[PDB]
Design a binder for this molecule. Sequence first.
Ligand code: ATP
Ligand code: ATP
Ligand code: TTX
Ligand code: ADP
Lengths: 179, 500, 70, 59, 478, 480, 53
Amino acid sequence: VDSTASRYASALADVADVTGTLEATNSDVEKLIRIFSEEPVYYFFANPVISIDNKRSVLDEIITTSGLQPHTANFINILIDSERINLVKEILNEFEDVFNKITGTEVAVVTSVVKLENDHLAQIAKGVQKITGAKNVRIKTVIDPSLVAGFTIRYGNEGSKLVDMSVKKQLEEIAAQLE
Amino acid sequence: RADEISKIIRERIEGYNREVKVVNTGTVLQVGDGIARIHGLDEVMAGELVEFEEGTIGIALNLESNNVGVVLMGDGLMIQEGSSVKATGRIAQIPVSEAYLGRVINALAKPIDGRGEITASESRLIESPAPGIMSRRSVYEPLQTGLIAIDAMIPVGRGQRELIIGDRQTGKTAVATDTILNQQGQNVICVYVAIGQKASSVAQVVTNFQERGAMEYTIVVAETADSPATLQYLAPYTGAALAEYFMYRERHTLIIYDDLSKQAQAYRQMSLLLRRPPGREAYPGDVFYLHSRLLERAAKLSSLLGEGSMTALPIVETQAGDVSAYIPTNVISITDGQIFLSADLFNAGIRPAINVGISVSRVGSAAQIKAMKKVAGKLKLELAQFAELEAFAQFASDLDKATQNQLARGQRLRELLKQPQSAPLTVEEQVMTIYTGTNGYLDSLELDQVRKYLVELRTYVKTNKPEFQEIISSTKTFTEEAEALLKEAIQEQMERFLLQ
Amino acid sequence: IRADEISKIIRERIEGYNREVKVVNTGTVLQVGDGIARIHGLDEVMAGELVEFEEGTIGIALNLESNNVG
Amino acid sequence: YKNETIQFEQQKAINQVRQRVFQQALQGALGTLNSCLNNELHLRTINANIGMFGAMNEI
Amino acid sequence: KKNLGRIAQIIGPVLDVAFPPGKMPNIYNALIVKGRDTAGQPMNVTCEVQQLLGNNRVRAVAMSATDGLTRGMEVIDTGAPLSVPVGGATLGRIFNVLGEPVDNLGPVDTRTTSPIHRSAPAFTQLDTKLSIFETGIKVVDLLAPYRRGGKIGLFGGAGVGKTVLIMELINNIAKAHGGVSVFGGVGERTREGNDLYMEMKESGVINEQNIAESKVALVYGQMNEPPGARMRVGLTALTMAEYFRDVNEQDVLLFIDNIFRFVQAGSEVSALLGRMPSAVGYQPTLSTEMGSLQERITSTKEGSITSIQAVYVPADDLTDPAPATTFAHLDATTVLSRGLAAKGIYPAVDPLDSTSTMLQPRIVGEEHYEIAQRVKETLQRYKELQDIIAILGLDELSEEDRLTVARARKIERFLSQPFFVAEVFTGSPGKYVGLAETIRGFQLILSGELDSLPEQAFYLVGNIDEATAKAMNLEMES
Amino acid sequence: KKNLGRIAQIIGPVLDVAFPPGKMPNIYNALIVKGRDTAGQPMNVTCEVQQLLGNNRVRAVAMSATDGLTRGMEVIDTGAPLSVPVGGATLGRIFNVLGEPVDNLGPVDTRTTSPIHRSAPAFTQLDTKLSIFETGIKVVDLLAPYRRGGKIGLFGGAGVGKTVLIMELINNIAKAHGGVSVFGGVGERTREGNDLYMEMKESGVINEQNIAESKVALVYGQMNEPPGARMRVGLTALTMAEYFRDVNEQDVLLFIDNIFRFVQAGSEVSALLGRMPSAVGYQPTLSTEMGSLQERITSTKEGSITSIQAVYVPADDLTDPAPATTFAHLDATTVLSRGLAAKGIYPAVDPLDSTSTMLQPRIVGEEHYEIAQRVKETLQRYKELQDIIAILGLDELSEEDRLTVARARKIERFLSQPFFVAEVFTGSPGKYVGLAETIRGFQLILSGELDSLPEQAFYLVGNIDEATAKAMNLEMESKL
Amino acid sequence: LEVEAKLAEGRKKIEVELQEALGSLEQQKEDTIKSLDSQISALSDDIVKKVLP
Ligand SMILES: Nc1ncnc2c1ncn2[C@@H]1O[C@H](COP(=O)(O)OP(=O)(O)OP(=O)(O)O)[C@@H](O)[C@H]1O
Ligand SMILES: Nc1ncnc2c1ncn2[C@@H]1O[C@H](COP(=O)(O)OP(=O)(O)OP(=O)(O)O)[C@@H](O)[C@H]1O
Ligand SMILES: CC(C)C[C@@H]1NC(=O)[C@H](C)N(C)C(=O)CNC(=O)/C(=C/c2ccccc2)N(C)C1=O
Ligand SMILES: Nc1ncnc2c1ncn2[C@@H]1O[C@H](COP(=O)(O)OP(=O)(O)O)[C@@H](O)[C@H]1O
């Protein structure tokens, strides 16, 4: 996607790819997300009235304390320089799925009424891999009581492509007699 | 009997539980004024129908990088943000069958007459390709309208897109309606498409059809001004699909878009709501391609397709007599000649107000029979020359007998072309009328008795001599025999008229 | 959705950021179509200087912009 | 015309009351289906359907 | 518990409302902002959801003023479209866009409310009973007869007589009309509104006591109400009218004055809502907003709405998109001209351009049809000769041309009528002259009995024998 | 071909496709999008790269209908500007934008190909012979002679007669011309294309029974096709005719119709590709686009392209930019006026507005130059004294005035002609008229020997002797 | 004159007979739906057991 956030996230993740520090910056941005999730952090870093000088100062202090990759601290200073800081949370969010599309780790969403055993998780995971053609699959755990009795697992680029049998069966056998 | 149909229903639903098929389904970001953006749907085709959770049909046009641009076919009220939208796996299909004959229907091929749903087996694409160069033949049949001007000077043949252009209240709908209801015993399929018109005006047209009996062979695909922009935009395409289904099956068809400028306005609205950039007069750049992709599905198919036919009579609207406007110039460039309807001629008593001087027909005399060709080959050229002369002969004060005789015969020709409302003229009456005029008999009696002598002459020939009818029908040629009969009739009835 | 952010210029800035340095020696070709070209770098080019790409196709720097050269 | 019209509309009314009775059937179905232990039976059924999804995966 | 949210942005009447992730309102749900003024809580600020901007926020336009709303105020969502009181209780009262009474009297009984956005009637619920209806205006009854249950438009510029014409139509028809009238004013002068109310009280139409029997209900969004209001006052008046039609099964009159202010309000709303502009300045959804009003008006099997909608033509340019879109909707249009008004021939309707759909012989009778067509013929011939006579003069025309010109002058002057609400401008009384006098007078004029008469005697006369008497009085002034 | 890109955005006929980082197609390199027809089979649609827009993304327009395409489909860079079959293999064949055969016969002999986009001939190559050929039309061969080995442009609104006049120019010149013709149809009604095909069929110029004996090769950029084909078929027919002129060194005939549909499709696609609007609605890349077409259509030392093309003007207004840009590139221009079309004077060539570069004394003969000058002068005097008449009456003009007025109206009538192909429209059969016959007849008319004959006798008449015969027949009919 | 008056009367008669036939078909349809309501009570009995697969 041509979202500028995705552009920056792709640049960062691809630098990580051509170095080999992939998981090392993955954890880095995974913690950066929770840094910026608390609102005053983002508000301070984003509102431009604050001087870029002390902005960089506090950012360097956070670099030292929390611990950041060389290239990743560099990238955050690059954002603070080029004034894309309104998009910091979005860049940290696009890093996740661009790194997943890098490693072929198709994160999937499975949804049922109650929990399934990890045997069922491995079943559906291997099924998603044999329909998708990925390098790996990591399954996300969800419950949806709006379903009656079934499972509706999601895959694809977004959660676009979907197969489902809990209430889809209900409404499709509705429509037959409601022809 | 009530339960056994539900028995077949339950043996259905036992074999009808669920079938695992991968459906593309994403969420909704923006919803406003008929246009709804979509998040995801990376596999939906261009133009593929969608299903919003409420049950609203849609079409995905803008497959943008992040989001999907989906137009709504309906209202946008009950749609909720964040709800799911599901791709259909179909592309603008329309159920079509012969049962539609007599039905007023929405743009979704669903009935609005209250006569219950239409049974249809096949389904044809709303947007369909055109027949190729080799997949058509030239136009040779005539399509009878019933007006002497249209069917003599600027002919319309089966499979010729003839634009009925004109101002407001000039008789465009009346011309198209008379072209339709004249077709009762000619075995054609009529299709009346109304885009952005009064519900009551549509109802008047339908009631007129029902009382004149022309409803048996006519579909009325009508949309009112409250209809969504996508429905107003897709109405003519669905009408053309219904027409094409018969055109391919060796039928003859006639479709009237009435009018096209409202469809172009609907496409302008939907394009400006998709945030596309606007061209001249805030129309999108490709309204030309919009109208051409619609109109060029009218043709006269070749012999190796059954010689089916579809004649399109689209109606447009010149605002304030201006043909230079963008949509009028596009449609007079697209179509195969046009028919101009001028408010001045409507005012000045000449009904129909067919301004011949800027009317054309690209098929020419190839859309008439041998009789009317022989009697009126040079008619439009000489009538244009006489319009010039009568316009010019007022600057000169005194004129000689030859010019005055040409002028008088031209005025009698102008009195000939007057045609009342809902009065059709068969080809026999048309040929004999053009003969009686163009020969020079009518110059003696005066302009007020022209019309009544024509009425009396036609009644006289129809009573006395049916072999004129027989010749013009079976032989289709204006033989010396029929000419002798007609001259006897003109002489006899002229003497009788002098007496009366 | 902005110019000069091509997800490769950002990559090389991540590589060599340390401070803001001149680039006038070099310039990449970012966007090219219908007779124009947007060029990143050339920070010391003049308005109107004949720039020369590969393949000998000459150019002129008319619209000097924020981080690119039209 | 009115004869065939009322015939069509009466058939539509039959369809209407069919829709309503089948709605009642679905509500009673959900009421009996509210058994949570039967859901576990439906969970083993959906395990069989996971096997069938693997079959479709093969297809 | 109605869901609640904050106001994000305020830019003019645009109100950006942030809502919780859970329950965002549908389109047209009346968001009621709590509202704060100098002191006190004016709940009066009512909006309408127009868009779903995404990320749990929506965009609405404000039916009241926005000066005073601050960032972070709360909103409530009524879950329904903006409803207005209807029924017998609303008979004889003045209203708002908000259905709030203004007439300085008690409230209204909320027993039967009706949302403003009610979908149009279907195709089975129409009526095709073509029918004439006279108004006493010579030209209106002759050259473009009016229809029952169908729309009528007074196209014209400014100051040429749309308001006077519609007021005279009121006094002619509504007083003896057998049903109910609903005068709805979409952005006209508050002075016109007050004066109409005063006439309604002086004549007793809205009986000051026993207000339940009044047969006239007023709805006033004037020219100073915000563009959020002047875009829906029309819909409010229409909901009242169509409630009367649907439930009480009566013949309703609905005088809208005038729908171009509604269209322009739509334009000012869309320009701020950020849609891309269509032709010269209007909204892209212009045909749709026009039809969404014009289509809920039509007469049905149960009742009939014969609405007379004045239309304002901008800068005397009928080519403009708003009149060029309303022409497609109205049945009989009466095109007021400025040239006739300048030369003094009142009413200044254009006899040629004013064209109806009911002017058909199988509707009106062949005698009426013949005389109407002959008048249009002679007037067309005059309009053609106008260019030549401007330069030269009447001296250099042929004999038939001079005869037709003289007949044309006499026709265009006989086509004038002194009105009962024009007595403050002319001093001559109103003259009601139906079709029985109209047809015969024009038959005499196009026959030529009055060929030896002067011209000025037909100026401002009702009857043809009135014109004859004034002619003999002109010859009595030596 | 190796590199595989993924369709990313499709706004109608505009395809923005992303590629691997190092393998980016060149401008105008064709793209084959691996589609999927509604029946499940693939549907190969061609594209052409218009604009490299960075982020490994190029913008390519669709030569075919995009309805049915999806994001994420495969595409393959065939590396070459669109390759069209050229040579004698294409003679007697009907084509499309991609050089595909659509006459429904055997596939084209793919042996020879040529890329559509190429460069113009150098300044040395330009052949310089100023010589006219006779077309058989009176007004044409008298007031706007056509330049053999040059460019001829026809202007006119819709419904005035330029399509039929190209049909007439064909019926006169093409078959008798021993060379090879090429008909390029840019934005043309399928009815008119099929009409041309079947008329050339019957006329034996294609010789269906023995293909590859023909003299014509037809291309058809129809109107139903999306803007890509309407943008590229003019260049296609040009590349065919260019192979013919260079490699086979034989005089060619190039009927292009229209030339305005080219700029139509250009302006249609332009707004989406990212450009800012020019004037009344056209693209910024207008003058250079039409120049790129016209400067490729030219005559060189090897071969000579004699090219007729009709320029459809919108709303009859010659102030529009695309007509404005054609005029500078067209040698001899003939504009059709809706007035002359309305008064039945056909062909409606405006004699006073239309000009040619060939009409010079040294180039076409002194007497021909002078007679043309006198025709122009007389018609100009008429159109100046027009409103003087129209407001004074005709009596108050002098003897010379009324004389020249009558003779000018007589010239205006005589400039009409029954066409062979317009027989369906007039009713009378056509009349090929020789140049000397035209010159002599107009000498007679201006000298005033026919100076009592009726005006309508000069109407729809080939030669002046036929005009006198018509006058005599009318003189008989009058007293009888 | 005679055909005018008699045909006005005839079209009036045709429309009012249309309205009478409409009322008759309405009442017949409602009766059939109520008998169908009894039949569909029997249907409601014999459906819910099979609706569960
Ligand atoms: N030959 C004729 N004789 C008598 N009246 C005619 C004739 N032709 C048309 N009319 C009259 O012209 C009027 C207008 O016709 P029509 O309904 O076609 O208008 P219109 O052009 O469709 O207007 P709009 O396009 O706005 O609907 C009709 O009332 C009809 O009676
Ligand atoms: N019968 C008449 N006699 C004399 N003058 C008249 C007559 N009818 C209208 N007028 C003139 O019309 C003018 C006012 O017109 P009116 O207010 O009715 O239209 P308007 O200004 O367009 O209304 P609005 O602007 O509210 O739509 C008055 O100045 C009056 O002189
Ligand atoms: C000086 C007046 C115009 C105050 C404004 N009031 C209005 O324009 C009206 C009353 N509206 C629509 C408001 O409620 C406030 N919003 C504005 O439009 C405006 C418009 C405005 C624009 C530019 C300068 C001043 C005002 N508010 C700022 C107002 O408060
Ligand atoms: N020589 C001619 N004589 C009479 N009519 C003609 C002649 N040439 C063209 N026309 C008329 O012009 C109409 C259309 O002309 P056409 O060639 O299509 O012009 P355009 O392509 O500009 O529309 C035809 O219907 C035909 O009747």
